[PDB]
Design a protein around this ligand. Structure first.
Ligand SMILES: Cc1cc2nc3c(=O)[nH]c(=O)nc-3n(C[C@H](O)[C@H](O)[C@H](O)COP(=O)(O)OP(=O)(O)OC[C@H]3O[C@@H](n4cnc5c(N)ncnc54)[C@H](O)[C@@H]3O)c2cc1C
Length: 524
């Protein structure tokens, strides 16, 4: 056996997994990533305007109190270069890179039932054995594309936001962006003032609220650092872990004037989860409440965008649901003389040619640069790109052919000694706290197994199915089921997130570890 544990991924999840298993459990560990450096999604996504949804002081690890006191809190939210710099400092400080093998994709992982360990094979045909396999593959996968006809004929710059190259310049160029979601809102806002002309190809108009990303004073920062213990206690006692005052107030239980005041206060403070969950307690649950949130944003759109026909084209016709978006000046962009909005739901893209995007009306939109601002695949995307075989050689893709599943978001029946970080049916909450929660639970179970000579840990089918039912029962009280959210698993009816909150999740998994790991088979 080469290692006690093998870790796939060197983002937030894989890095803390390595720290806990190597330095706290004193195990022999190796992590692998295709990336050339740590950071995960913050290494891969380097597009213009990439920015956290979580406020800076909470989008980080909490377990190293020296790091908390040391860390840079430059603005209220944190840019992609600065998240990457942070994670590199973590790897510096805890000497992680010597046990990470970079530029190394994992092709397959086959469980050896005779030896109760995993046979792991890299894409360069290196074989490694390890008792435990930690799959820290992240909650999102890159989504490829149904090829637009003729895309291969385009002779200008063709950039995908999931593989954004260095050295891109914008001045003097006609630029187009396909995609107006999470990523597209950030890219469009960042580049509109830099290009000669911007054409935005909008397939679905989405809601977005201001992010309110401001510089943090030394005073601001000192008071956060003085109160950090209480700040994290509030995280662990919350549903979402975003530092919000999570509301229980029903939207329709106050007057129209008081409702507008509450929305306006959130709009001015900024933040997508703030607008959706600090204002009232039923926006994601009650359609009448949700329409109030919709209308507030639609009214802001009509006030910001002066041309009422442009404002109409930007105005959504859907539920205010899915992961809430925020922006640094998105609707304002459409007042610019050098910006054109194309509704490609009404006027679809039908072809790309050597110098243009062609819409169904026959119009050739001439471009020097075309940007595909893509969405993301759900969690199981990264898993079916690895040939993972468990008991009886059944693959993870086959085991999940009828929909992904898990016990607690961390274990899959028929896949012993494998632990997922951010696997299917993990809570919806701020990611670093979820990740620390899961990594610490896995390490407690693994350290337990080492102390009790147990060498095969497996969730039962009944435990997996009960968790699917638990998640289904919560998720179907909400509008997220009805809203068809790609990042929650609508393209895999079902929402593959535990939506009972971080505090309740930590109660659920602590009950399991406290009751002799019920739902798990512990074998010697
Ligand atoms: C632009 C953007 C902004 C975000 N902002 C927020 C935010 O504000 N708040 C929040 O809570 N979440 C946010 N997220 C969600 C984000 O996924 C998490 O916060 C967190 O970064 C996930 O870390 P991870 O280590 O779990 O996964 P990742 O960072 O995705 O790391 C997974 C790693 O696994 C590697 N890997 C996968 N398959 C293989 C293989 N076969 N072989 C080798 N390596 C492999 C990948 O290369 C990747 O580096 C954001 C995501 C994006 C894309």
């Amino acid at each position: 056996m080469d290692f006690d544990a093998i870790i796939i991924g060197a983002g937030f999840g894989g890095l803390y997994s390595l720290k806990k298993l190597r330095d706290d459990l004193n195990l022999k560990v190796r992590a692998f990533d295709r990336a050339t450096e740590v950071g995960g999604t913050w290494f891969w996504n380097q597009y213009p305007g990439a920015l956290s949804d979580s406020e800076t002081h909470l989008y980080c690890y909490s377990w190293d109190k020296e790091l908390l006191q040391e860390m840079e809190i430059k603005r209220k939210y944190i840019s992609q270069p600065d998240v990457l710099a942070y994670l590199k400092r973590v790897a510096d400080k805890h000497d992680l890179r010597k046990d990470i093998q970079f530029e190394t994709g994992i092709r397959s992982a086959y469980f050896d039932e005779e030896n109760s360990f995993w046979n792991v094979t890299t894409e360069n045909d290196e074989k490694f054995t390890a008792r435990f396999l930690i799959t820290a593959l992240g909650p999102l996968s890159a989504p490829n594309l149904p090829k637009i006809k003729g895309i291969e004929t385009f002779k200008g710059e063709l950039h995908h936001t999931s593989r954004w190259p260095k050295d891109v310049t914008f001045s003097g160029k006609r630029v187009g962006v396909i995609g107006t979601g999470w990523v597209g809102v950030q890219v469009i806002t960042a580049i509109a003032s830099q290009v000669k002309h911007l054409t935005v190809f909008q397939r679905s108009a989405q809601y977005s609220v201001p992010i309110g990303n401001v510089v943090m004073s030394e005073t601001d920062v000192a008071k956060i650092k003085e109160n950090y213990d209480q700040i994290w206690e509030n995280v662990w006692n919350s549903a979402l872990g975003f530092g919000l005052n999570e509301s229980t107030l029903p939207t329709m239980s106050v007057s129209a004037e008081e409702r507008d005041k509450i929305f306006e206060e959130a709009w001015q403070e900024g933040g997508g989860f703030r607008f959706m969950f600090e204002t009232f307690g039923d926006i994601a649950v009650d359609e009448t409440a949700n329409i109030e949130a919709q209308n507030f944003i639609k009214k802001k759109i009509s006030e910001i965008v002066k041309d009422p026909f442009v404002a109409k084209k930007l105005t959504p016709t859907d539920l205010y649901a899915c992961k809430p978006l925020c922006d640094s000046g998105y609707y304002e962009i459409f007042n610019r003389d050098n910006v054109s909005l194309e509704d490609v739901k009404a006027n679809p893209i039908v072809e790309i040619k050597e110098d243009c995007v062609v819409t169904a009306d026959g119009v050739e939109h001439k471009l020097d640069m075309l940007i595909c601002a893509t969405g993301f695949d759900a969690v199981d995307g990264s898993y079916k790109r690895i040939d993972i075989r468990g008991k009886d050689g059944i693959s993870i893709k086959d085991h999940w052919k009828d929909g992904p599943n898990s016990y607690l978001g961390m274990m899959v029946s028929n896949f012993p000694n494998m632990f997922m970080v951010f696997g299917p049916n993990t809570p919806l909450a701020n990611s670093p706290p979820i990740i620390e929660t899961q990594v610490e639970w896995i390490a407690d179970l693994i350290g337990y197994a080492e102390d009790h000579q147990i060498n095969q840990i497996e969730a039962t089918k009944d435990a997996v199915d009960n968790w699917t039912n638990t998640c289904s029962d919560i998720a179907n009280k909400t509008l997220f089921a009805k809203a068809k959210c790609e990042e929650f698993g609508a393209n895999v009816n079902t929402v593959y997130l535990y939506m009972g909150g971080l505090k309740e999740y930590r109660n659920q998994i602590s009950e399991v570890s406290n009751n002799n790991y019920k739902g798990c088979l512990l074998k010697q």
